[PDB]
Amino acid sequence: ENMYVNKVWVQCENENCLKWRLLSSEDSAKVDHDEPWYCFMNTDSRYNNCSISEEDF
């Protein structure tokens, strides 16, 4: 069925990057809150690299 998961922002922990990334519902459910997160872990292929500029907020 529909899981009604909200999208979250997550921050890249590459000290050179530190950009905020807006995750899909699916990625937002999967995020391990107890572990580091980095841009390459984003399945959003538009924002999945530290070289890619941060989406507007």
Partner: peptide, 6 residues
């Protein structure tokens, strides 16, 4: 992971 709800 550091996160913010939308």
């Amino acid at each position: 992971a550091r996160t913010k709800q939308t």
